[PDB]
Amino acid sequence: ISKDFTNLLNTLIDGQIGAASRQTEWFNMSPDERTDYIKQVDERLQEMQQSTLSVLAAQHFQMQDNPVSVGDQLQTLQKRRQQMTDVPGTPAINAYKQQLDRDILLYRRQQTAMTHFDSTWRKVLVMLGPDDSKPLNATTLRENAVDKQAKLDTEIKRLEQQLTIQVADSTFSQKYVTLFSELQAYKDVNARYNALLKASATEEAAALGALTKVPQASDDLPVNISLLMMEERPGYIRMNVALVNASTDGRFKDFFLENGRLVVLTDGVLNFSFGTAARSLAWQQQYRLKSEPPSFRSPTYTPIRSVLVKTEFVEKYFANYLVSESTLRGGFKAQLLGNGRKMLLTSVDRKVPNQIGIQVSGQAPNTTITREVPLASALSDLINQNADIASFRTIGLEGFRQSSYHPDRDGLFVNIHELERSVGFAGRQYLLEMPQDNDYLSATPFGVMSVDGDKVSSSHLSKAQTDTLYQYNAAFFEKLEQLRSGGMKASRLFEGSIERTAFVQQLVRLLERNHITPAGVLAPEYPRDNMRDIKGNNLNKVLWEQAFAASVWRSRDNDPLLFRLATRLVKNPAVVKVLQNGYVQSDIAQARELLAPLYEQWRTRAVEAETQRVASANAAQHPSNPKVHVFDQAEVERSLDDKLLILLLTGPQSLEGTDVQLRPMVEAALLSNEGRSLRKQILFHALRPVADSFSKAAAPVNPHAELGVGKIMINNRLNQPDPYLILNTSSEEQAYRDGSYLIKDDKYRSYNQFRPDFKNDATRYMNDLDTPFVGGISGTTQTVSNVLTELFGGALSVKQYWQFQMANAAFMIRNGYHSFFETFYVAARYEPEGADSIGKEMLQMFDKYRVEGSKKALQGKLYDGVMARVLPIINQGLSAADEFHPPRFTRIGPRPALLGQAVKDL
């Protein structure tokens, strides 16, 4: 709001632009984007105050050990609040107080409900039991049956009536929770009593146990009381169902409002869930409670569909499922709807309670045979009966349409909006500064980020470090909070103040540490060629290279060459080494999913091997050890993954024996787009260890004078791992434990480990061309292309060569391993000698554009210069209708091609 804060932001913006080299996350903005940027700066600063400094305060204000107990939760929270009612007002403090208050309310409600449940249970057991002239026993309970079953029914009816009246109450209340707990107690005791009456002589003692076993240990709630605690308003639970994507064309499961009625787009969806989390994972770890398993949060990340539904419907069919306690459940349950239809309930998660797979099915309307079939309309109508028509909403829908607009791109993120939409997201974790070291460092509220050339870690904070971090950061945020309101008069950051300069020097590095920079947040509709990506690469060239990689990847053109390569390569013994790579294990899991019937049949074979292991361990003479008298999980898992790898490299023709009966299915699978793309994505990962296994020395065939004769200046990287981009992709919650941890090596880490070494001549060259930079000149591509004559066992045609090398370059761009240029440069250096070779020209063209780029923006001219020379060699055999043509670089963002495959019927 304050004009002074706005002038300060404009000052630091202008100054940081003026200081810029090439490759910077700042760039000059439109005079409209300026305001959206400042608005997002202010918003995200408020988010920081509410959502990271608050949780840091909740670990500074721990200097005295309050009374703490896992059972006395309500009292522990209450005294934690009374510890801090004296603390001065501050937004992080107010947010902490309000969170603790709401959690106090919830725990109070739950404890009340459990108490009145227990008292009602005891009361009903006294009512059903005999007089004190006899002990409570099954015989007297049976003698009581004919009267007190009807008494139980009468009380149940009365309670249901009174509670249905009380549902008119506008908010949760003592009477509401009371009557609810009574109704649940009466229902459960009635059910257990009737089970006892039905119990045989062998069951009777167990049913009497189940009656006398009050849940007074409070080790888990009554299920219906858990549903009560999930109620968003008295008598109603919030249902939700999560999409794969917004299904405007029917490709995805969906559930949407159509003509006032709610409509499921498909006959069942695996992705329903009920309730909502009471607090973020940050607060969950601050309380040091168990965090909800990630299999709830992992499976989808796009906007989610939700409405309030009548709790009676949920508790009728779905309370049978929703129990957190391990009641025996299979893969499925089938529920008779009163209209004669089935509803199928599906155990889509074997640990989490509150997410459900649901399907309705029944006798197909208006058909010659009474086949039962799934029925989306029946489910829609049943929901519309049980739903409230009011307060249907889609979570984040405008956010999606105002940041992604649609499923945007087939490649890595470009700004934080695409990151937060990406599968890697989990929750936005801002970092803050730990400046009392000799040079400034980044810490979470739980731990300071250890960084190393090989490794990234956090050391958890001891108390002195928490006091340092809190007091410093709080003093800074207090200054910022003053500046927004009391202005320069209050903050005393006068224009000549050394304190003002220190403040700005801190703010700029805060706004760098989190990618709140303009390239991080602006996400424009049509990218001006001035703008730069989140790493300071030119935006439009990155977009174009991604669209190129996508188009090359989707084409079916190179596949006859690549699968010949794979068919030969699979014979090398070294290919086994590929499977122990950490990144391959990301994607063979998807092959385990695609080939589920094979993955199951194979595993059902493999589990046999345990029997031979135990047999051999018993056949060994006088075994002094259970030498292998165990189920070795790792052995079978390795052998299974090796089988799946081999079945992915060589074609389905490799199938043999009984599995030939399944071979037509596997053939239909592997020829899908996801099949081909997996097959070649695993092929290219398999290529590197085989290439390395020849250990042939470097020997480029085209010399180049500008960049050192006979060598290449490969790799060319400085290891400078970005902590924010690491933590804002889903590491395990082991990072969040308040305990020291070593972070996962996700595939994006290869995209985030590296920063250009501006001292190297190769960097100077590339900065002259002003290409994007990702991991430097690709020594991997050198090592591969040096041995192609041995991989294929003979010289390639320049057509076959350039085909393979473009598929490789598309693979490198798709996974974010390198730029276009970082591959094609070493290609042109390695292109075989021959009558149609073109690398000599390509080198001279690079030099020609270098001597320009040091003065002028090339605006994609380099890419056209390359494609002009490559395309007529690739398409040399093809008809003009079937040629490949990449998307065409333009001032506006990359537009679709106008020729060949890309138009044919697409």
Author numbering: 4 to 909
What text appears in the publication on this structure?
The bacterial Makes caterpillars floppy 1 (Mcf1) toxin promotes apoptosis in insects, leading to loss of body turgor and death. The structure reveals that Mcf1 is divided into an N-terminal head region and a C-terminal tail region. The head contains an N-terminal effector domain (NED), an activator-binding domain (ABD), and a protease effector domain (PED). The tail consists of two putative translocation and three putative receptor-binding domains.
To understand how Mcf1 is built in molecular detail, we heterologously expressed and purified the full-length Mcf1 complex from Photorhabdus luminescens and determined its structure using single particle cryo-EM to 3.6 Å resolution. Since the toxin proved to be inherently flexible, we performed a series of signal subtraction and local refinements of subregions of the complex. The resulting composite reconstruction allowed us to build 92% of the Mcf1 atomic model de novo. The structure reveals that Mcf1 is a monomeric, asymmetric protein. Based on its overall shape, reminiscent of a seahorse, it can be divided into two parts - an N-terminal head and a C-terminal tail region. In addition, we noticed a large spherical density of 10 Å diameter in the middle of the head that is coordinated by five arginines from all three head domains. Its location at the interface of the three domains and coordination suggests that this is a negatively charged molecule, which stabilizes the head region. We therefore call it head-stabilizing element (HSE). Interestingly, these putative receptor-binding domains are arranged such that they fold back onto the tail towards the head, resulting in the C-terminus of Mcf1 to be located within 2 nm distance from its N-terminus at the neck region. Moreover, the C-terminal region forms multiple hydrophobic interactions with a helix bundle of the ABD and supports the helix that directly connects the head and the tail region of the toxin, thus organizing the neck region.
